[PDB]
């Protein structure tokens, strides 16, 4: 895979190559892939390879990353949650 | 995403944002999502976003959390198991 | 399971028994299995057991391994990416 606008990756604290879950609001598809850095501020959300069978252009998706962390940090950790407009720009 | 009654989250030792597996007894759906804290004592089990395609109001579900732990602790660890009535109140 | 040519395993830094995700470009299947060492230089990509229902001889696949790593290393880590010809030989 999934190409993500570098701005959304920074906003969401995602690294190039970090495992990402894509869930499709339109068709209910759920898959696991990794993040590729897309042209900054382009609002690109690009489905590459096998995933294109399940997740289609125009679909509303949620992109999710998880982390393993010790009990103490888990209770205090604040996840980076990015809301976006119809043009994939943060709000 | 899954909105869970804060009472069930405390009973089950789940944090807001903790990864949760939902398995659907009615339709056999299985998905991975995270816990959102729901109104305490409301008995809410709310499916939010793409997951709503697979897991439906009225369905009987099992909610599961896993942990990564060193071999020694894994052999001794006791999971938190919450049984609930038809109104999602602990027993 | 998946039997992989020992040359591709070395090229991709995969061990026998290492967890592998197979994604199928032809049919959109996605599954998790482990690597078995195949005859070196044979170009074997063999689907063994239940996975054979989903991923078929002749299919184009991507084989993916993930690692858990501390935040610091995750930001700097360079994955091993292997491109292959139609005969499953590295380029």
């Amino acid at each position: 895979x999934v190409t993500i606008d570098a701005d959304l990756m920074d906003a969401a604290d995602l690294l190039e190559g970090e495992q990402v879950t894509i869930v499709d609001i339109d068709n209910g598809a759920r898959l696991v892939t990794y993040a590729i850095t897309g042209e900054r501020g382009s609002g690109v959300i690009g489905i590459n390879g096998a995933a294109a069978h399940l997740v289609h252009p125009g679909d509303l998706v949620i992109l999710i990353a998880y982390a393993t962390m010790d009990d103490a940090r888990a209770r205090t950790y604040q996840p980076r949650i990015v809301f976006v407009d119809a043009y994939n720009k943060p709000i | 995403x899954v909105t869970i009654d804060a009472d069930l989250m405390d009973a089950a030792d789940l944090l807001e944002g903790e990864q949760v597996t939902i398995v659907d007894i009615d339709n056999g759906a299985r998905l991975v999502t995270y816990a959102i804290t729901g109104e305490r004592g409301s008995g809410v089990i709310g499916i939010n976003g793409a997951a709503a395609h697979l897991v439906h109001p009225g369905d009987l579900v099992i909610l599961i959390a896993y942990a990564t732990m060193d071999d020694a602790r894994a052999r001794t660890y006791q999971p938190r198991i919450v049984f609930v009535d038809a109104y999602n109140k602990p027993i | 399971x998946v039997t992989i040519d020992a040359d591709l395993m070395d090229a991709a830094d995969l061990l026998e028994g290492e967890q592998v995700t197979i994604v199928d470009i032809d049919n959109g299947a996605r599954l998790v299995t482990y690597a078995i060492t195949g005859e070196r230089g044979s170009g074997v990509i063999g689907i063994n057991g239940a996975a054979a229902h989903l991923v078929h001889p002749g299919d184009l696949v991507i084989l993916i391994a993930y690692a858990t790593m501390d935040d610091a290393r995750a930001r700097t880590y360079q994955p091993r990416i292997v491109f292959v010809d139609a005969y499953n030989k590295p380029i």
Partner: peptide, 24 residues
């Protein structure tokens, strides 16, 4: 004991393109 926690979420993004035959 380590828990698996949400760290990143991009909420209701629109897929802009798809390529079955991507190379990269």
């Amino acid at each position: 004991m380590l828990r698996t926690m949400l760290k990143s979420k991009i909420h209701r993004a629109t897929v802009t393109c798809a390529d079955l035959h991507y190379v990269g």
